[model samples]
Target chain A: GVLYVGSKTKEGVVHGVATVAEKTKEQVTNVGGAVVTGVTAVAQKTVEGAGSIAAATG
Target chain B: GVLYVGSKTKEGVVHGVATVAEKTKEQVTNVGGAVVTGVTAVAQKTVEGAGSIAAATG
Candidate 1:
């Protein structure tokens, strides 16, 4: 089964942000590689998070 | 100029996230002179970013 929910205005924007934040949190935690880890991981996530915020602002 | 403004519902959350994201990015970049840089820098920022999102969600 699948549940497709939606909203308008600020509700939609907030919902979108929540999805982004949750996914980013999960991905960033498992973020491991040669050049990107630890602090680098945090920095990368922050950058991405900021982008999401900016996008959601509109 | 002081741009005094406000929002409701998810708008506030989005705005708060933006502020946190920006501040975290700035501080994390300045996070040096220790092992909490590089990958750790990214990691830290990501952690903080996630926290901000969580807080804003409520």
Candidate 2:
């Protein structure tokens, strides 16, 4: 019991894009989390390195 | 040591964006890989199912 005002082809393409978005959402979020974590870690290390250098000099 | 021509605000914002881009490159690549893999899997299954239906009809 499927019907469409537009072409089924258009409907199928839209469905495919929706499926892709649904499938990728969790993966993208997890990936974004990893990215943030890595950047924060590097920033921390850089700050620590600067602190150590300052302590040695002064 | 540390220096800048523009406002530190501008420099910091640019630096932050650069950090994000560098950090997120790998994670984004990985997520994109997953998206392609999932899409290909579904497309394969759909084609297979259609083939079976055609075979039965023929």
Q: After superposition, how far is residue A4 of candidate 2 from its true place, in Å?
A: 61
Clashes per prediction? 17, 0
Query: Distance from true position, residue A14, model 2, in Å?
Result: 30
What's the i-RMS of each model?
A: 19.6, 26.9
Angstrom error of the Cα, residue A46, model 1: value is: 21
- For model 2, state the Cα shift of residue A53 in Å: 28
How do the residues B1-48 of candidate 2 rate in per-residue lDDT, one tens digit apiece? 222122111111112111122223221211111111110111111111
What is residue A45's positional error in candidate 2, in angstroms? 4.0
What does candidate 2's lDDT look like per residue over A1-58, in tens digits? 2211211111111111111222232212211111222111111111111111010111
DockQ of each: 0.09, 0.02
State the weakest 10-residue window (summed lDDT) of model 1 chain B.
Answer: B26-35
Model 1 chain A: ten consecutive residues of lowest lDDT: A12-21
For DockQ, the strongest prediction is 1
Misplaced by over 4 Å in model 1 are: A11-58, B1-10, B14-58
lDDT of 1 by residue, A5-49 (tens): 122224221111111222122212112111232211122234333
